Amino acid sequence: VNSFSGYLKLTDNVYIKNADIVEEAKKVKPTVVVNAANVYLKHGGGVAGALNKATNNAMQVESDDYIATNGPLKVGGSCVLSGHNLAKHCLHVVGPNVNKGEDIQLLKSAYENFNQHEVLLAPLLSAGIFGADPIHSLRVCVDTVRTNVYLAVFDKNLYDKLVSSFL
Ligand SMILES: Cc1nc(C(=O)N[C@@H](CC(=O)O)c2ccccc2)c2cc[nH]c2n1
């Protein structure tokens, strides 16, 4: 039993909800919140910009120190950093950005990072400003993640499409 509320069960381990991941994280304080990161951890917009704003820019400060020490992530890769006031940990995961021309086949590799954590709150990787088809991303999530994933979907219209079209 966990604290997530109001989710629709898609499979044994994948759940979905129309919700703001920022407000959801603040309420649940999950062990792991997933950020839709880029390889430079520049949290300027989309989910990353929103998560970082909620931390009063502390996420960005921590991220800049991480990059200065370690260099950029790989597309498809991840790192674990602090969750600040939102969660215990933030798993920064780099899905391919279609608007940069990156291989969508890397979306599966990106979702594989979720399997290192028993329970996560997360967005659809590569959705939104990353330009991928969210129906394809939900499909990859369901077919790749084996741990318990709670998806927050910001747009009410997109969610209903995701639920109504889910196989
Ligand atoms: C869960 C979540 N998602 C996003 C986000 O950018 N979401 C994409 C995908 C989607 O609909 O979830 C989007 C695509 C088209 C229109 C609006 C949003 C944000 C931004 C701030 N907080 C968030 N929380």
Tab-separated table of C-alpha atoms and ligand atoms in Angstrom:
chain	number	residue	atom	x	y	z
A	1	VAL	CA	0.000	0.000	0.000
A	2	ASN	CA	1.255	3.477	-0.958
A	3	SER	CA	-0.052	7.046	-0.826
A	4	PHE	CA	-0.947	7.574	-4.505
A	5	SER	CA	-4.623	8.453	-4.993
A	6	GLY	CA	-7.035	8.630	-7.912
A	7	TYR	CA	-4.973	6.701	-10.480
A	8	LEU	CA	-6.382	4.500	-13.231
A	9	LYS	CA	-4.741	1.063	-13.356
A	10	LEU	CA	-3.520	0.231	-16.868
A	11	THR	CA	-1.543	-2.949	-16.064
A	12	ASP	CA	-0.251	-4.808	-13.009
A	13	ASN	CA	2.371	-2.089	-12.427
A	14	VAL	CA	1.493	0.942	-14.651
A	15	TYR	CA	-0.981	3.557	-13.389
A	16	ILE	CA	-2.035	6.893	-14.929
A	17	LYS	CA	-3.716	10.129	-13.799
A	18	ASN	CA	-4.526	13.601	-15.130
A	19	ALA	CA	-2.487	15.652	-12.658
A	20	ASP	CA	0.211	18.295	-12.230
A	21	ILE	CA	3.384	16.411	-11.291
A	22	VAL	CA	4.568	19.390	-9.208
A	23	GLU	CA	1.417	19.459	-7.069
A	24	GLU	CA	1.346	15.657	-6.997
A	25	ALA	CA	4.945	15.436	-5.766
A	26	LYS	CA	4.397	18.083	-3.084
A	27	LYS	CA	1.396	16.156	-1.748
A	28	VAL	CA	2.719	12.589	-1.945
A	29	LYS	CA	6.401	13.374	-1.274
A	30	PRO	CA	7.264	10.175	-3.165
A	31	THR	CA	10.546	8.350	-2.779
A	32	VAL	CA	11.344	9.092	-6.440
A	33	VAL	CA	10.049	11.767	-8.802
A	34	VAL	CA	11.230	11.497	-12.408
A	35	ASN	CA	12.362	14.626	-14.235
A	36	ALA	CA	12.191	14.968	-18.030
A	37	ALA	CA	15.832	16.059	-18.218
A	38	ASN	CA	18.266	16.951	-20.976
A	39	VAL	CA	21.911	15.870	-21.055
A	40	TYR	CA	23.042	19.230	-19.619
A	41	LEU	CA	20.431	19.227	-16.833
A	42	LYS	CA	19.330	22.697	-17.984
A	43	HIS	CA	15.842	22.810	-16.490
A	44	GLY	CA	14.430	25.624	-18.588
A	45	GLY	CA	10.924	24.558	-19.610
A	46	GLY	CA	8.446	21.720	-19.785
A	47	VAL	CA	8.390	19.355	-16.830
A	48	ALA	CA	12.017	20.171	-15.982
A	49	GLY	CA	11.388	23.910	-15.886
A	50	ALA	CA	8.324	23.365	-13.699
A	51	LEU	CA	9.989	20.965	-11.250
A	52	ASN	CA	12.971	23.279	-10.909
A	53	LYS	CA	10.800	26.363	-10.271
A	54	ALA	CA	9.044	24.535	-7.416
A	55	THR	CA	12.462	23.974	-5.758
A	56	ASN	CA	13.230	27.720	-5.888
A	57	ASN	CA	16.085	26.921	-8.362
A	58	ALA	CA	17.842	24.571	-5.899
A	59	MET	CA	17.492	21.752	-8.438
A	60	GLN	CA	19.364	23.827	-11.030
A	61	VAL	CA	22.141	24.759	-8.572
A	62	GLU	CA	22.652	21.101	-7.652
A	63	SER	CA	22.491	20.101	-11.324
A	64	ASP	CA	25.127	22.617	-12.408
A	65	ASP	CA	27.525	21.218	-9.805
A	66	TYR	CA	26.765	17.684	-11.035
A	67	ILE	CA	27.544	18.609	-14.665
A	68	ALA	CA	30.687	20.534	-13.716
A	69	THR	CA	31.977	17.353	-12.043
A	70	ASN	CA	30.660	14.611	-14.335
A	71	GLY	CA	29.893	16.132	-17.726
A	72	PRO	CA	26.652	15.637	-19.642
A	73	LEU	CA	24.391	12.629	-19.416
A	74	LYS	CA	23.759	10.322	-22.366
A	75	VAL	CA	20.482	10.438	-24.268
A	76	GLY	CA	18.692	7.441	-22.775
A	77	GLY	CA	20.615	7.831	-19.506
A	78	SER	CA	19.869	9.126	-16.033
A	79	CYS	CA	21.268	10.265	-12.732
A	80	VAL	CA	19.879	10.296	-9.191
A	81	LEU	CA	19.977	13.661	-7.420
A	82	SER	CA	18.082	15.206	-4.519
A	83	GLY	CA	14.318	15.527	-4.642
A	84	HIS	CA	14.545	18.791	-2.663
A	85	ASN	CA	11.099	19.750	-1.276
A	86	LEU	CA	9.286	17.507	-3.774
A	87	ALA	CA	10.501	13.941	-3.120
A	88	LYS	CA	13.334	12.093	-1.443
A	89	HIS	CA	15.149	11.674	-4.777
A	90	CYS	CA	14.813	13.002	-8.300
A	91	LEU	CA	15.675	10.586	-11.104
A	92	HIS	CA	16.708	12.829	-14.015
A	93	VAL	CA	16.011	10.785	-17.171
A	94	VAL	CA	16.941	11.915	-20.690
A	95	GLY	CA	14.376	10.832	-23.248
A	96	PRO	CA	15.143	11.580	-26.897
A	97	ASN	CA	14.076	15.050	-28.036
A	98	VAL	CA	12.442	14.670	-31.463
A	99	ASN	CA	12.808	18.416	-32.021
A	100	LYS	CA	16.591	17.792	-31.929
A	101	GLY	CA	16.510	14.770	-34.265
A	102	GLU	CA	17.331	12.070	-31.706
A	103	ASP	CA	16.571	8.392	-32.278
A	104	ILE	CA	13.165	7.480	-30.847
A	105	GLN	CA	14.492	3.944	-30.276
A	106	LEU	CA	16.352	5.467	-27.309
A	107	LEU	CA	12.997	5.938	-25.560
A	108	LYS	CA	13.073	2.308	-24.409
A	109	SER	CA	16.571	2.771	-22.967
A	110	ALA	CA	15.326	5.878	-21.141
A	111	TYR	CA	12.440	3.969	-19.549
A	112	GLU	CA	14.785	1.131	-18.494
A	113	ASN	CA	16.212	3.520	-15.897
A	114	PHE	CA	12.878	3.310	-14.046
A	115	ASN	CA	13.502	-0.394	-13.304
A	116	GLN	CA	16.199	0.558	-10.788
A	117	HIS	CA	13.501	1.991	-8.471
A	118	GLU	CA	10.658	0.055	-6.877
A	119	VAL	CA	8.103	2.913	-7.099
A	120	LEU	CA	8.192	6.186	-9.049
A	121	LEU	CA	6.095	9.218	-9.948
A	122	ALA	CA	6.853	10.146	-13.535
A	123	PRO	CA	5.867	11.933	-16.758
A	124	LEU	CA	5.658	10.333	-20.182
A	125	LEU	CA	9.230	10.446	-21.437
A	126	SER	CA	9.780	12.469	-24.600
A	127	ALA	CA	6.218	13.866	-24.455
A	128	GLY	CA	5.358	17.541	-24.431
A	129	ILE	CA	8.164	19.785	-25.683
A	130	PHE	CA	10.368	16.747	-26.396
A	131	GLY	CA	8.133	16.169	-29.430
A	132	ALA	CA	7.400	12.427	-29.333
A	133	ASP	CA	3.963	10.843	-29.741
A	134	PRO	CA	2.652	10.345	-26.176
A	135	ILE	CA	0.595	7.307	-27.210
A	136	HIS	CA	3.846	5.701	-28.368
A	137	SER	CA	5.565	6.743	-25.138
A	138	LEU	CA	2.862	5.240	-22.887
A	139	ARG	CA	3.153	2.030	-24.928
A	140	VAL	CA	6.936	1.936	-24.459
A	141	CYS	CA	6.502	2.639	-20.748
A	142	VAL	CA	4.068	-0.260	-20.285
A	143	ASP	CA	6.247	-2.623	-22.323
A	144	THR	CA	9.532	-1.627	-20.592
A	145	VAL	CA	8.949	-0.634	-16.957
A	146	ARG	CA	8.420	-3.542	-14.554
A	147	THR	CA	8.501	-1.572	-11.302
A	148	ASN	CA	5.500	0.402	-10.031
A	149	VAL	CA	5.089	3.628	-11.997
A	150	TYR	CA	2.518	6.352	-11.327
A	151	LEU	CA	2.144	8.633	-14.319
A	152	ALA	CA	0.984	12.234	-13.928
A	153	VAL	CA	-0.414	13.711	-17.155
A	154	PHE	CA	-0.882	17.471	-17.035
A	155	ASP	CA	-3.309	17.924	-19.943
A	156	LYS	CA	-6.841	16.663	-19.309
A	157	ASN	CA	-7.511	16.325	-23.043
A	158	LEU	CA	-4.382	14.239	-23.708
A	159	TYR	CA	-5.094	11.969	-20.745
A	160	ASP	CA	-8.578	11.034	-21.977
A	161	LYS	CA	-7.058	10.209	-25.353
A	162	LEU	CA	-4.418	8.097	-23.577
A	163	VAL	CA	-6.999	6.202	-21.509
A	164	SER	CA	-9.558	5.794	-24.273
A	165	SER	CA	-6.963	4.508	-26.747
A	166	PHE	CA	-4.985	2.263	-24.388
A	167	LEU	CA	-4.744	-1.339	-25.521
B	1	LIG	C1	2.867	15.680	-15.810
B	1	LIG	C2	3.350	17.059	-16.217
B	1	LIG	N1	3.598	17.214	-17.514
B	1	LIG	C3	4.036	18.412	-17.983
B	1	LIG	C4	4.270	18.557	-19.459
B	1	LIG	O1	5.041	19.370	-19.964
B	1	LIG	N2	3.483	17.705	-20.124
B	1	LIG	C5	3.320	17.460	-21.546
B	1	LIG	C6	2.732	16.030	-21.641
B	1	LIG	C7	1.495	15.870	-20.762
B	1	LIG	O2	0.370	16.177	-21.233
B	1	LIG	O3	1.737	15.469	-19.609
B	1	LIG	C8	2.355	18.452	-22.168
B	1	LIG	C9	2.071	18.360	-23.541
B	1	LIG	C10	1.166	19.263	-24.122
B	1	LIG	C11	0.542	20.248	-23.333
B	1	LIG	C12	0.824	20.338	-21.959
B	1	LIG	C13	1.723	19.434	-21.372
B	1	LIG	C14	4.220	19.474	-17.061
B	1	LIG	C15	4.639	20.843	-17.097
B	1	LIG	C16	4.581	21.306	-15.811
B	1	LIG	N3	4.148	20.298	-14.977
B	1	LIG	C17	3.917	19.158	-15.712
B	1	LIG	N4	3.478	17.964	-15.245
